[PDB]
């Protein structure tokens, strides 16, 4: 069923984050893993899979550790040919050339589209729709992560969603609607002067998927 | 392929000054981090100064605070190290390093881990 919408004072306030917002920003500013039709080559711990994926652009990784919520998810995708799409990290990437991410995995077979599919993001500032823009995927089932990355990546460029020290926006959540059912993620870091990249991205480790045909995306921001 | 070529190393005397320079080339994209490391014979390689995110994040090792200044010209794609009040302790091979990975890695920001690209270095000498 539907996840309920944010209650009063449920959302992280960016004014209560006193650290460097840079460390959030760099997760959505040109920082992503992407690969087509690959199969795991190894495994470190029981809830992860390792893929041979080369950073052709910047050469920052040859292997990617994809971390799941549980063993079942890893077992499921172990020997499957998959597509990978997600926001990765290096700082405190535990992997005994390398990088870490969570989820972002979909079966390749039976999930490709003849042509790219568009999903319109409706962006609200203090309730008002001032901006709309499409994200595209080639997948019938696509991870919320992939969509989330694409949305925030856009918004980091244009609207400066995140900056080195702090955001123009006090609160922000991204909402995914499929028919009646919906869910959302808080786009702002927990309060304090310590931002843990790995901890934040761990929300993607459920590998949550949506139908790219039915899903609508709404971004609700508030100003200062 | 990335290339870092350091220069400006020399043989000075206690209380002297040197300005290191590094010419970066071969990528055509924007580098996130650029830094200066040093290593003497015997001792492990140590990070000295760093400058990240269009100069928004500058860090120094304690032993060079107030004496060394890292700086950047984006127009030239050069990084500099103004080395004032030099001491025998500062004698070493100085290396420029670079990195395209983002973030300010608390306490690991001047470690060798933070950087993937490296020059061949320039010798610095300081005589009592």
Tell the residue number behind the tokens 């042509």, with chain if given.
A115
Is the separation of the CB atoms in A144 and A127 below 8 Å?
no
Identify how many contiguous H helices and E strands chain B contains and give both numbers.
0, 11
Domains and their CATH numbers in chain A:
14-30+110-222 (3.10.20.120), 33-107 (2.40.50.110)
Which of A18, A19, A21, A22 should be substituted to probe chain B, the one whose Cβ sees the most B Cβ atoms within 10 Å? A22
Cα A186–Cα A118–Cα A32 angle in degrees, nearest 5: 55
How was it solved? X-ray
Which of B102, B112, B115 should be substituted to probe chain A, the one whose Cβ sees the most A Cβ atoms within 10 Å? B102
The reply to whether B107 falls in a domain is no
B100 vs A22: CB contact, 8 Å cut-off? Answer: no
Query: Which residue in B67, B86, B73, B69 sits closest to B124, CA to CA?
Result: B86
Q: How many beta carbons lie within 10 A of that of residue A218, not counting itself?
A: 18
Rounded to an integer, what distance in angstroms lies between the CA atom of residue B19 and that of residue B59? Answer: 18
B103 vs A197: CB contact, 8 Å cut-off? Answer: yes
Beta bridge partners of B24: B4
Helix (H) or strand (E) run with residue B96 in it: strand B92-99
**CATH number of the domain that residue B74 is part of:** 2.60.40.10
Query: Which residue in A146, A142, A155, A107 sits closest to A213, CA to CA?
Result: A142
Cα A217–Cα A80–Cα A105 angle in degrees, nearest 5: 25
Structural domain boundaries enclosing B118: 3-102+113-127
Q: Which residue of A has its CA nearest to B113?
A: A91
| Quoted resolution (Å) | 2.3
Q: How many beta carbons lie within 10 A of that of residue B12, not counting itself?
A: 17
Is the separation of the CB atoms in B13 and B126 below 8 Å?
yes
Q: Which residue of A has its CA nearest to B100?
A: A58
Rounded to an integer, what distance in angstroms lies between the CA atom of residue B127 and that of residue A24? Answer: 46
Rounded to an integer, what distance in angstroms lies between the CA atom of residue B92 and that of residue B112? Answer: 16
CA gyration radius, chain A = 17
The reply to whether B108 falls in a domain is no
Overall number of domains in chain B: 1
Q: How many beta carbons lie within 10 A of that of residue B22, not counting itself?
A: 26
Is the separation of the CB atoms in A60 and A33 below 8 Å?
no
DSSP character at residue A154: H
User: Which stretches does DSSP call E strand in chain A?
Assistant: 33-38, 48-52, 63-67, 82-86, 98-102, 105-107, 112-125, 128-139, 141-143, 171-178, 181-186, 209-211, 215-222
> Closest partner residue to B102 among A31, A59, A194, by Cβ?
A31
Which tokens is A26 given? 């760099």
Rounded to an integer, what distance in angstroms lies between the CA atom of residue A64 and that of residue A9? Answer: 37
Strands B11-13 and B122-127: parallel
Residue A104, phi then psi, degrees to nearest 5:
75, 25
Check if B57 contacts A (Cβ < 8 Å). Answer: yes
- Which residues fall within 8 angstroms of residue A111, CB to CB, at 6 or more apart? A83, A139, A140, A141
Q: Looking at beta carbons, which residues of chain A come within 8 Å of B104?
A: 20, 22-23
Check if B116 contacts A (Cβ < 8 Å). Answer: yes
A58 vs B53: CB contact, 8 Å cut-off? Answer: no
Strand order in the sheet with B18-25: B3-7, B18-25, B78-83, B68-73
Rounded to a whole number, what is the distance in Å from the CA of B104 to chain A's nearest CA? 6
Is the separation of the CB atoms in B122 and B8 below 8 Å?
yes
């Amino acid at each position: 069923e539907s996840q309920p919408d944010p209650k009063p004072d449920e959302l992280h306030k960016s004014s209560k984050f006193t650290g460097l917002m840079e460390n959030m920003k760099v997760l959505y500013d040109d920082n992503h893993v992407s690969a087509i039709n690959v199969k795991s080559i190894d495994q470190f711990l029981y809830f992860d899979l390792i893929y041979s994926i080369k950073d052709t652009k910047l050469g920052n990784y040859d292997n990617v550790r994809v971390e799941f919520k549980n063993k079942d998810l890893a077992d499921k995708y172990k020997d499957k040919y998959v597509d990978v799409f997600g926001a990765n990290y290096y700082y405190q990437c535990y992997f005994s050339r390398k990088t870490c991410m969570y989820g972002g995995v979909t079966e390749h077979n039976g999930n490709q589209l003849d042509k790219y599919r568009s999903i319109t993001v409706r962006v609200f500032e203090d309730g008002k729709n001032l901006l709309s823009f499409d994200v595209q995927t080639n997948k019938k089932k696509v991870t919320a992560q992939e969509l989330d990355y694409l949305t925030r990546h856009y918004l980091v460029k244009n609207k400066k969603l995140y900056e080195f020290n702090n955001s123009p926006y006090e609160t922000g959540y991204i909402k995914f609607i499929e028919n009646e059912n919906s869910f959302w993620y808080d786009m702002m870091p927990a309060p304090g002067d310590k931002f843990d990249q790995s901890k934040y991205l761990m929300m993607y480790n459920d590998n949550k998927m949506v139908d790219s045909k039915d899903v609508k995306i709404e971004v609700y921001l508030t100003t200062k | 392929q990335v290339q870092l070529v350091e220069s400006g190393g020399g043989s000075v005397q206690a209380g002297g000054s040197l300005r290191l320079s590094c010419a970066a080339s071969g990528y055509t994209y924007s580098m996130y981090c650029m830094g200066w490391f040093r290593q003497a014979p015997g001792k492990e390689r140590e990070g000295v100064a760093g400058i990240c995110a269009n100069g928004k994040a500058i860090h120094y090792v304690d032993s060079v605070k107030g004496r060394f200044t890292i700086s950047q010209d984006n127009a030239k794609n050069t990084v500099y190290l103004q080395m004032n009040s030099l001491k025998p302790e500062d004698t070493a091979m100085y290396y420029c390093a670079a990195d395209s990975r983002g973030g300010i890695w608390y306490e690991q920001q001047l470690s060798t881990l933070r950087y993937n690209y490296w020059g061949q270095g320039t010798q610095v000498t300081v005589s009592s």
